[PDB]
């Protein structure tokens, strides 16, 4: 009748060796930046008590679960903010496989940016085919050369693309070699922990397919040239791991992110997995459905609708749209700029429908990288009550002013 997976989760202050010979002042989850790995089964219960012990008040927002407005933890929406040396349980299925992320939605810039960043894995409720998975937490860090933190909010910088890391690293490490068994298909989960990053992420030489896009499975196709990860997206990412002895980067354009080292195994090489099972998503009805336009855009650089969001007051009140309660609606999404944004809803899963500019074949995620003056629409169930944050996930762009609160009631 109920499984449980139960976790005690601690943030608090992690002195990080990232630059060799430095130390970089960082904060963590469970000792580590980016965070300790959480797993859940689908189907079943995630525990999880955390405690906060850093200085300043957080949450812990679980970035793409659809769980209750209670769990969702955005400060004076979801809770209060959790304060220094209190705790606060996070119970809530997991209904959906795949790749999530947890993170803080308070005082975001700086705190992501400090390193309060983690995966979460929704494990698959029967097997995947897949014998062999790899986690692989991209993040780019804003330390300069003596690993100090350069500002995570440089208003030249928030006000285009955001505010830029310099240290790219991969589970922590620059540029690690990573093992993997030769011959084997190995589903590499990509998880982009980052505040303001897209990596043009392009893997040369391997035979590498997509199977899913941020938590949710598509019907397999090829890598190709490019998968273009945003700040907050993911991918499993399968790979036919070559002969042993060869050696494959995993690139951000020319370059490396990672060198995937194939390692001699004497498992028999398997075949590519079957697709993954849909997570159960409500299906648009696109007949049925009604649209709703949305135009985006040390103070507000960013519009939605016209409005800044004031990261600083309690405006989640004056919600920029009301949901009915199992509606069905479209999201025209408008970048009316130069600039791509990756836009996330909370709460809930779109479908993307088409673009401007990209062809679309149709898939689910709780985000959409909105490139440059594109015009991409996007549909949803209005699933699950409350409200919910809808903003784009460059932290920079969230915290000037590219947020809103949808109300489902
Ligand atoms: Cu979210
Ligand atoms: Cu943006």
Not at 110 to 139: A, C, D, I, N, T
Not at 148 to 156: D, E, G, H, K, S
Not at 272 to 279: D, E, I
Not at 389 to 401: A, K, Y
Request: glycine share 8%.
């Amino acid at each position: 009748s109920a499984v449980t997976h139960d976790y005690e989760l601690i943030a608090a202050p992690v002195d990080m060796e990232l630059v060799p010979g430095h130390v970089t002042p960082a904060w963590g989850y469970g000792g580590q930046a980016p965070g300790v790995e959480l797993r859940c089964r689908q189907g079943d219960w995630l525990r999880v008590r955390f405690i906060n012990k850093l200085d300043e008040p957080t949450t812990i927002h679980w970035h793409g679960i659809r769980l209750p407005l209670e769990m969702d933890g955005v400060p004076y929406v979801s809770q209060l903010p959790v304060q220094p040396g209190e705790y606060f349980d996070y119970v809530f299925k997991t209904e959906d496989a795949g790749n999530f992320w947890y993170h803080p939605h308070e005082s975001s810039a700086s705190q992501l940016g400090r390193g309060l960043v983690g995966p979460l894995v929704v494990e698959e409720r029967e097997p995947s085919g897949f014998r062999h998975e790899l986690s692989l937490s991209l993040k780019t860090w804003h330390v300069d050369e003596q690993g100090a933190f350069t500002p995570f909010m440089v208003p030249r910088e928030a006000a285009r693309e955001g505010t830029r890391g310099r240290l790219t690293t991969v589970n922590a490490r620059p540029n690690p070699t990573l093992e993997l068994p030769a011959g084997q298909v190995v589903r590499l989960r990509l998880f982009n922990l980052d505040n303001t990053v897209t990596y043009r992420l392009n893997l040369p030489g391997a035979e590498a397919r997509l199977y899913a896009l941020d938590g949710h499975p598509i019907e397999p196709r090829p890598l190709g040239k490019e998968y273009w990860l945003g700040p907050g997206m993911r991918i499993d990412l399968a790979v036919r791991v070559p002969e042993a002895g060869r050696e494959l980067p995993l690139r951000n354009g020319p370059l490396r992110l990672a060198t995937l080292k194939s390692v001699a195994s004497v498992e028999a090489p398997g075949d590519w997995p079957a697709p993954l099972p849909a997570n159960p998503v409500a299906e648009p009805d696109l007949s049925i459905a009604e649209t709703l336009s949305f135009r985006f855009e040390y103070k507000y650089w960013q519009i939605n609708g016209q409005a800044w969001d004031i990261n600083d007051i309690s405006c989640a009140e004056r919600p920029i749209a009301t949901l009915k309660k199992g509606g069905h609606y479209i999201f025209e999404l408008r970048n009316l700029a130069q600039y791509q944004h990756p836009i996330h809803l909370h709460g809930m899963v779109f479908k993307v429908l088409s673009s401007d500019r990209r062809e679309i074949i149709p898939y689910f995620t709780d985000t959409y990288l909105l490139g440059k003056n594109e015009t991409a629409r996007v549909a949803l169930v209005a699933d699950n009550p409350g409200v919910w944050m809808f903003h784009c996930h460059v932290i920079d762009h969230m915290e000037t002013g590219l947020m809103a609160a949808i109300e489902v009631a």
